[PDB]
Amino acid sequence: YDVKPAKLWVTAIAIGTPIVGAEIKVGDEECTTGNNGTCVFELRPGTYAISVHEHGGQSAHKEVSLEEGNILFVSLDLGAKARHPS
Amino acid sequence: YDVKPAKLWVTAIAIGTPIVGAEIKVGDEECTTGNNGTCVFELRPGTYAISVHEHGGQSAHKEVSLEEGNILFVSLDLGAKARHPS
Amino acid sequence: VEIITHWVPHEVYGMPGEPDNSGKVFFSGLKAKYMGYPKDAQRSPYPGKYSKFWKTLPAYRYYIPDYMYNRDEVRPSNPIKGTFKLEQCVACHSVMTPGIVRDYNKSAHSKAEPAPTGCDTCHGNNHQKLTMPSSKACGTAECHETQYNEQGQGGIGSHASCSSFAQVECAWSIERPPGDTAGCTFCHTSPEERCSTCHQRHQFDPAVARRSEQCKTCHWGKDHRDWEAYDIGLHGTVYQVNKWDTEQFDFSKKLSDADYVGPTCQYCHMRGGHHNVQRASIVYTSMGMSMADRGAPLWKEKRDRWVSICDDCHSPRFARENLQAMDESVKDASLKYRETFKVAEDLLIDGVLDPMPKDLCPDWSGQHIWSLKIGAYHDGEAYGGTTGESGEFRMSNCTDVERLCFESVGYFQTYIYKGMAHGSWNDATYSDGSFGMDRWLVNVKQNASRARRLAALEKKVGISWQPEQFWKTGEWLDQLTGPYIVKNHPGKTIFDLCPDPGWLDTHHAPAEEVEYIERKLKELGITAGSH
Amino acid sequence: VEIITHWVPHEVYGMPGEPDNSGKVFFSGLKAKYMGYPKDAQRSPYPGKYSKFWKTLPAYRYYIPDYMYNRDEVRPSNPIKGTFKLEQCVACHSVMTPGIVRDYNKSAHSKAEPAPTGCDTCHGNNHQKLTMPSSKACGTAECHETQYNEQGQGGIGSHASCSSFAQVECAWSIERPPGDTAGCTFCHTSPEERCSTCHQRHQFDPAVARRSEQCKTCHWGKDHRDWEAYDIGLHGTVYQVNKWDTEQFDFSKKLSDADYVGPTCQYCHMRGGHHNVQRASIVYTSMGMSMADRGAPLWKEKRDRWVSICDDCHSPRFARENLQAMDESVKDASLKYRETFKVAEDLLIDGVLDPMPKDLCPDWSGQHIWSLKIGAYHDGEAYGGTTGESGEFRMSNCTDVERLCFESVGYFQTYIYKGMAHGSWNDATYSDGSFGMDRWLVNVKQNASRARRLAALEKKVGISWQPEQFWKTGEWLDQLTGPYIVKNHPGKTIFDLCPDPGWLDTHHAPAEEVEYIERKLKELGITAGSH
Numbered sequence A, B: 001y002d003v004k005p006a007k008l009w010v011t012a013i014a015i016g017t018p019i020v021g022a023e024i025k026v027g028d029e030e031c032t033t034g035n036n037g038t039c040v041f042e043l044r045p046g047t048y049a050i051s052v053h054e055h056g057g058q059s060a061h062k063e064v065s066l067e068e069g070n071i072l073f074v075s076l077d078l079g080a081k082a083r084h085p086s
Numbered sequence C, D: 001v002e003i004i005t006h007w008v009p010h011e012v013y014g015m016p017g018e019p020d021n022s023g024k025v026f027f028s029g030l031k032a033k034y035m036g037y038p039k040d041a042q043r044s045p046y047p048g049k050y051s052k053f054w055k056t057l058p059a060y061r062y063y064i065p066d067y068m069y070n071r072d073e074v075r076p077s078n079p080i081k082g083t084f085k086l087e088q089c090v091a092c093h094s095v096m097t098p099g100i101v102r103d104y105n106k107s108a109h110s111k112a113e114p115a116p117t118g119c120d121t122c123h124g125n126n127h128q129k130l131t132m133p134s135s136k137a138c139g140t141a142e143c144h145e146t147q148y149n150e151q152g153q154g155g156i157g158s159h160a161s162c163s164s165f166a167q168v169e170c171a172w173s174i175e176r177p178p179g180d181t182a183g184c185t186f187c188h189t190s191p192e193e194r195c196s197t198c199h200q201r202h203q204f205d206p207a208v209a210r211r212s213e214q215c216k217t218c219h220w221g222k223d224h225r226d227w228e229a230y231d232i233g234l235h236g237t238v239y240q241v242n243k244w245d246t247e248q249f250d251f252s253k254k255l256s257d258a259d260y261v262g263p264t265c266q267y268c269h270m271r272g273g274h275h276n277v278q279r280a281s282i283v284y285t286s287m288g289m290s291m292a293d294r295g296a297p298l299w300k301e302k303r304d305r306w307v308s309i310c311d312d313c314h315s316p317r318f319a320r321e322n323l324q325a326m327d328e329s330v331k332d333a334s335l336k337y338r339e340t341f342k343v344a345e346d347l348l349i350d351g352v353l354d355p356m357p358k359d360l361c362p363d364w365s366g367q368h369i370w371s372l373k374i375g376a377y378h379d380g381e382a383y384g385g386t387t388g389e390s391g392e393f394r395m396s397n398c399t400d401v402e403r404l405c406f407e408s409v410g411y412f413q414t415y416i417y418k419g420m421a422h423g424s425w426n427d428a429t430y431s432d433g434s435f436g437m438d439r440w441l442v443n444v445k446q447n448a449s450r451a452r453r454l455a456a457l458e459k460k461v462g463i464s465w466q467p468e469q470f471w472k473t474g475e476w477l478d479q480l481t482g483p484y485i486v487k488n489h490p491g492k493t494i495f496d497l498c499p500d501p502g503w504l505d506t507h508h509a510p511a512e513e514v515e516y517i518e519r520k521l522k523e524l525g526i527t528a529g530s531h
């Protein structure tokens, strides 16, 4: 029997615009966002802590409980202070 | 072997409009233009002189040396003096 | 929506006084120094009466090709040298200009025997002495003389004269910088000069030429909603719904055998495949701006012919009476315009028009003749010009009252004629038709009222109104022919400076047309008209 | 046509003073008490700099979904509970929303192996935690990163910025009640935010996306007749005649292999299937309202690239010279507008403009800056605002002269650029093109004349004209941002109240663009511009 892993999308926003180069921590996994501002994680069932950090000093946190074969998109806005020139 | 003739298009105009009635002679073959205002000649390769004579006493002259199997369109604008009512 | 002055690198922002042809961005197009068209650019002069004042662009070479391309003095340079066989044209261009060869290979010209009508047949063998084939080239006795002669049967305002008369002697085109009216060259010259019209090069497919949409590219817009009227009418509805159903519309059939459910432009205007598109026309009415009762006994035989075409899918009576309705709409439209014109004419006669023609920029001719003056109807000091001479009919460089009058007869009235003729009921009414003229009549009356109220106030208070400077001069106005003639040739007009005979001098109405009218006027006992 | 006040039961007739949101019929929309948009309705705030003043409707949630739908704080309620397998999505929705499932089943997404891209892949498994997939969702590295990155290469005025800049910081949208400009949200956000653009959900067919008509839904109308110009031009004529003939147009082919008889929007703008639709653009000219000679040596390489595209079916020369004609039309158009603007500017400087900006309702910013003021060109007391600051360019809340100027450059001028670029000769001339600007110039001059004549009369008679109350206040005007800021935040502007960095602060021109311009200006020896 194969336990189908959960798929978690995490999008980092700064009042509408995607944050580039933000680091998203979900469980033990790390992802540094590209132009999307979106990281996709494939995770085993369980409860996880999502944390989005960006070099400006702004952070967003959300705790998520994932079942078997769950697909969830998470959208976290870090406010206007997370918007940096170029 | 067949010496493929050269096709000579001679268009008589009077600052735009085609001159009807105007006659064109090249070599021995004598053409006289209709409403179209053009004469299609088929000539043996060589050098030929083109003359465009009119009833209204206005002419244009030119000379062409046609090789084998040439197609050349010639446009000769005789001017406003080669333009009579109706 | 803003005039965006950011993001784009500053290095490319144009600053006041800099040339417009530098390639720099001028915000809202302001503050640039007008350099004008490239007069050093290798090109051809335009043909015809007004050659001297006809400013041209390189692109124009293609549009009247016999004069503007094919003469040795004018033919443009070409980087490819040599004289070639047909095989060579095809092979090289198959890669260099792929689409042209793709089209050519599909064409009947390529398949023709014993010898194909190849690139060389239409363009020549010598790549340094290439030519662009005009209608004259296609219409040679050996080739398509039939279609050339058919088209050439057309009178004024037909495909036979749309270049030589309408465009070559186009007032506005001559008057303005080239590019202002570049589109006019590209549109007008085609039907008369280039047979790639309707059946596109290089495929030359009669099947595609039989489609209604072919005409839309020219027969649309502000001053002739031919396409729009047809398209939205029930004929156009039938067409759009059925055109790709081969059981309803078979474009492979010749027009003589056309058995469509509904008519196409070609079905009516090119009956039997005749290339004189004006063949069935009753009388030329200057785009429908001039008025005629086409249903009058004078034109009985010509209207009957139209009923013969509608007869195909309707009772004579139904068609007869529907076209009679058109006649009535046309007459009622001119009734409105006569009222509209009266208001405008009264402003001129009373001298309260703001401003009077004398205070406007000189017209294309270099004169101060009233815009709306029709030489055949108007004569007097107030109108200007010699006896029988008309003004420059325009929507530009005039008063609002003059402009709105132009719009009423030159746009809205044409929507009524073309609308009713093609079965577009809304084009003749709500959609800038009858009710368009209504709206403009109100607009004219209001403008007349305001101008008269100001003149009355200024008289009583003792102000003599000095017409503003912008009526006389301005950045665009200064570039026109009018100011140039007044300055550089003081005593004379454009007609003096261009003494050559025009199109009208060498082209007359056919003998049969005069013969018909004279016969019918005698038959009915109506007085003949004047010059 | 009447305002019909009968037949419909009286019980539902709205009487003066009653709420407009009661659902009662108010004849001609009169006498109702304006209640405004439902601010209690569960919805999302708009993102961006002006979030605080951005009034939103529930419907907007879909249009910028990452911020406006996908956040837990905002996600709307749903009557269906549970987390489901893909089978369950399809089975339930096959009946509940049949068309979506019909589309999905046709899509390649459903057929994909080893696992399909199913409803759950794009929307989520938990029906209480559903999400709407943005361009970011499609553009994940595992999926369609290529197309996302391609589109994202676009600069200002591209599909990459049409939401984030143009719409999120849209002056008029912010200024007005929502619904006044609801259509702007629905149109602008799509290309940037939703990849269901061009290839519709849920079928996502590239074959349908390759059709010209796809672009028409946004690229039409008053300020960009892109579709109209293409459609009526010979390219559009060829298209309409041949588009359902598979031998002429094969939409199954990829754009790299496109061998059509005539071009599509995609053929030119999405060359090779590249998703940056602006890739081939020469320079951003603010919808063509700003002016540039694109044929100038500065832009030689960029124009050459366009000739390379036309090369497919034309000689380089023919294409080069045709686009040169466009350049000339563009330059001649701005010549006219400069004359038009001068008339308007003179009214302001002479202070006889009726009325002056100070007597109009405050602009969106809460200021009385002149509508037509361009900060880069205009500075002075008469213009208003700080140095370098522009006015709110608008067709609303202004004088006729201001309005007609906006219309001339913002509508008619664009018809000339787009018209000439796409081969619509009438769009550049008769159909509100060159001759549109002509008509408006006359209209501006007349309005200037009248205003000056009144001012002169009032001086001599000793009347100091008090601008009417309706310039300042009115039922609609009172609902705008201007009056609110003046009343509630007296000393400050909207820029003070929204201090956050804007789009322009974080987004700059690409390095290669600046590098090219600097190289070319040095190569030709032209002075660089200013801020």
Ligand code: HEC
Binding pocket: C156, C157, C158, C159, C161, C162, C163, C165, C166, C187, C188, C190, C191, C197, C198, C214, C215, C216, C217, C218, C219, C265, C266, C269, C270, C277, C278, C281, C284, C285, C286, C287
């Ligand atoms: C542009 C290249 C055109 C296409 C394609 C078609 N027509 Fe045309 N047509 C065109 C012009 C410029 C003119 C006359 C201009 C002038 O000198 O006044 C015409 C004329 C006609 C007419 C006669 C109108 C009149 O007032 O007598 C008709 C009836 C007509 N055209 C019909 C027509 C049809 C049916 C076409 C499609 C097959 C068509 N035209 C193509 C320009 C162009």
Ligand code: HEC
Binding pocket: C099, C186, C196, C197, C199, C200, C201, D234, D235, D238, D260, D261, D262, D263, D267, D268, D306, D309, D310, D311, D312, D313, D314, D319, D322, D323, D423
């Ligand atoms: C092939 C797919 C084409 C591309 C790419 C472009 N054009 Fe085209 N054009 C094409 C056809 C088949 C036609 C119809 C030819 C006819 O006989 O009418 C055209 C037409 C034009 C025209 C108008 C026709 C004329 O006056 O000669 C113009 C002005 C034109 N084409 C220019 C043009 C330019 C500038 C292009 C690049 C941007 C371009 N075309 C692309 C086929 C194709």
Ligand code: HEC
Binding pocket: C135, C138, C139, C144, C147, C148, C151, C159, C191, C194, C195, C197, C198, C199, C206, C207, C209, C210, C253, C254, C255, C256, C266, C270, C272, C273, C274, C275, C277
């Ligand atoms: C549009 C208004 C056209 C213009 C301008 C020209 N042609 Fe045409 N042509 C047109 C149609 C609709 C058709 C099909 C008519 C039919 O009979 O069904 C044609 C057909 C031709 C043909 C084929 C002749 C035949 O066997 O039926 C030729 C050879 C042809 N046309 C030539 C031609 C030339 C030389 C033109 C310039 C003067 C020309 N055409 C103009 C529509 C239009």
Ligand code: HEC
Binding pocket: C212, C215, C216, C219, C226, C227, C230, C231, C235, C263, C264, C265, C266, C267, C268, C269, C281, C282, C283, C284, C285, C287, C288, C294, C306, C418, C421, C422
């Ligand atoms: C048959 C039902 C028609 C179709 C299809 C189209 N038109 Fe027509 N057109 C038709 C009539 C009966 C008339 C009035 C002629 C008259 O004087 O009684 C017209 C008028 C025109 C004109 C004006 C011609 C003139 O002499 O002034 C033009 C230029 C014209 N139509 C063009 C045209 C085009 C381009 C069409 C296709 C879209 C078209 N017509 C359709 C009859 C019919």
Ligand code: HEC
Binding pocket: C313, C314, C315, C318, C319
């Ligand atoms: C009933 C189902 C019908 C049959 C069978 C036929 N026609 Fe008809 N016809 C029908 C309607 C509803 C109308 C419209 C009447 C109106 O008031 O406008 C018509 C119209 C005609 C007309 C006149 C209109 C026109 O297009 O010219 C004619 C001349 C006509 N019908 C003839 C006709 C003939 C010959 C039929 C037999 C083949 C025929 N109709 C069948 C409804 C019906």
Ligand code: HEC
Binding pocket: D156, D157, D158, D159, D161, D162, D163, D165, D166, D187, D188, D190, D191, D197, D198, D214, D215, D216, D217, D218, D219, D265, D266, D269, D270, D277, D278, D281, D284, D285, D286, D287
């Ligand atoms: C609406 C949803 C659109 C569709 C469908 C297409 N386009 Fe678009 N396009 C749209 C907007 C709102 C914008 C820019 C707005 C702004 O921020 O200024 C654009 C932009 C373009 C451009 C660039 C224009 C410029 O000034 O640089 C091009 C060349 C363009 N669009 C072309 C285009 C084509 C070819 C399309 C069909 C495949 C198309 N667009 C679809 C809105 C929408």
Ligand code: HEC
Binding pocket: D099, D186, D196, D197, D199, D200, D201, D202
């Ligand atoms: C199926 C036959 C439909 C019915 C019935 C209605 N709509 Fe539709 N709509 C449908 C499709 C296939 C599309 C294209 C989807 C895309 O990706 O663009 C649409 C589009 C819309 C839109 C615009 C697209 C968007 O912004 O999301 C709107 C606003 C819309 N539809 C609303 C709508 C409404 C209110 C309807 C009832 C009156 C309606 N649609 C009917 C398919 C179908």
Ligand code: HEC
Binding pocket: D135, D138, D139, D144, D147, D148, D151, D159, D191, D194, D195, D197, D198, D199, D206, D207, D209, D210, D253, D254, D255, D256, D266, D270, D272, D273, D274, D275, D277
């Ligand atoms: C219209 C302007 C479009 C927008 C906005 C987006 N796409 Fe598109 N897409 C478009 C066309 C005309 C085509 C076919 C192009 C071709 O190469 O022939 C496509 C194609 C795709 C594809 C298929 C890729 C392929 O194998 O060729 C994908 C996967 C795709 N597009 C995705 C995509 C995404 C993710 C978008 C949002 C950012 C998007 N497209 C926008 C037209 C348009």
Ligand code: HEC
Binding pocket: D212, D215, D216, D219, D226, D227, D230, D231, D235, D263, D264, D265, D266, D267, D268, D269, D281, D282, D283, D284, D285, D287, D288, D294, D306, D418, D421, D422
């Ligand atoms: C090829 C022949 C084209 C087709 C088909 C379409 N367009 Fe185009 N477009 C073309 C050119 C050569 C230009 C001018 C570009 C320049 O700066 O020289 C344009 C212009 C536009 C623009 C403006 C882009 C800008 O940079 O400002 C837009 C937005 C645009 N075109 C859109 C567009 C659409 C939607 C089309 C389909 C209907 C379309 N174009 C057809 C060439 C061609």
Ligand code: HEC
Binding pocket: C061, C062, C063, C065, C089, C090, C093, C097, C100, C101, C104, C109, C117, C118, C119, C120, C121, C122, C123, C132, C133, C134, C194, C195, C196, C201, C202, D313, D314, D315, D318, D319
């Ligand atoms: C006669 C039936 C032709 C044959 C055979 C070929 N072409 Fe042609 N071509 C023809 C015409 C009537 C025109 C329009 C001329 C004008 O004055 O506008 C053309 C035009 C061209 C052009 C320039 C226009 C353009 O689209 O760029 C080129 C470069 C051209 N033709 C090339 C060409 C080639 C390579 C051919 C052989 C395959 C060919 N043409 C065949 C008429 C005819």
Ligand code: HEC
Binding pocket: C076, C078, C079, C080, C083, C084, C085, C086, C088, C089, C090, C092, C093, C096, C119, C120, C123, C124, C125, C126, C127, C130, C131, D315, D316, D317, D318
């Ligand atoms: C080699 C490659 C060839 C050969 C053998 C022929 N042609 Fe051409 N032709 C060629 C090029 C690269 C160009 C474009 C030149 C440019 O504009 O930069 C052309 C152009 C034409 C044209 C258009 C002329 C114009 O722009 O005004 C025509 C009408 C043309 N060629 C016709 C033609 C014919 C009839 C040939 C056979 C005899 C032929 N070409 C040969 C490239 C090549």
Ligand code: HEC
Binding pocket: C315, C316, C317, C318
């Ligand atoms: C011989 C030919 C016939 C026969 C046997 C029938 N019809 Fe007619 N019909 C005929 C002509 C020549 C005309 C046109 C008359 C004209 O307008 O000049 C008609 C007309 C009609 C109409 C239209 C009446 C109208 O215009 O208002 C209808 C509706 C009609 N015909 C119907 C019809 C029916 C039902 C017949 C069989 C019983 C019938 N016709 C016979 C020619 C002929």
Ligand code: HEC
Binding pocket: C001, C002, C003, C004, D157, D165, D166, D167, D170, D171, D172, D173, D181, D183, D184, D185, D187, D188, D217, D218, D219, D224, D286, D287, D288, D289
């Ligand atoms: C209607 C308006 C609107 C509603 C009010 C809003 C806020 C916008 C925003 C803009 C802006 C800003 C631009 C940039 C140009 C400028 O001069 O300020 C404008 C561009 C525009 C185009 C691009 C055309 C080009 O660049 O050649 C397109 C395709 C637009 C179309 C939408 C439209 C969809 C049918 C509606 C509604 C509006 N616009 Fe816009 N927009 N827009 N626009």
Ligand code: HEC
Binding pocket: C425, C426, C429, C430, D001, D002, D003, D004
């Ligand atoms: C042109 C006019 C017209 C010619 C003058 C006449 C007499 C009418 C009559 C009316 C009336 C009355 C109505 C009812 C509305 C009102 O406010 O008075 C009007 C409606 C109308 C519609 C309905 C649209 C809707 O209700 O949403 C339609 C489809 C109309 C179209 C015709 C039209 C055909 C192309 C032409 C011509 C006219 N109308 Fe009308 N009409 N109409 N109309």
Ligand SMILES: [K+]
Binding pocket: C308, C309, C311, C312
């Ligand atoms: K018949």
